[PDB]
RNA sequence: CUGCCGUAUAGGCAG
């Protein structure tokens, strides 16, 4: 693929900020980092998705070719943040791995969702996510700046 | 929370 890169963004356990707010908030800012950057190759997935519980996890994995990632990681857009999360390196993804859409989802939903705050409005808005179904091989699309597919699929592992 | 394509809170999207 284009994008046989990776990294894990880990959330660091806070007694006073339950994941899914860590989790918000790092989705924002990478959020943020996209819209400057730009492009639509770049993707995300929730490796440690519990879809029982309808939590995304621990972990935010970011995909990109291995330049794309460079770019994105070059960049101040964990500046504020840093301090709670645990980086891996950006690596080669294993092989083989099925595929699979990282979508957005609208309308109180059994989904997982981050709640994010609209940059004009101060409105808070839960942008719910779905991990669409394991296929083989990868179709052809994009994604949005929000990482989410707008056509794409990510190497889930 | 708001907004858009759409005859339609069919169905979609964008922040």
Redesign the pocket.
Known sequence: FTMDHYLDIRLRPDPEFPPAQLMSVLFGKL?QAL?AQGGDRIGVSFPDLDESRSRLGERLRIHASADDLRALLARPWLEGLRDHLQFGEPAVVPHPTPYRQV?????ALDLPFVT?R??????????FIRHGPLQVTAEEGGF???G?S?GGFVPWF
Not at 103 to 107: E, F, N, P, T
């Open positions: 959020h819209v979508s957005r989802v609208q309308a994010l609209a940059q004009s409005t101060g409105q808070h808005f839960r942008l949005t700046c929000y989410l707008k």
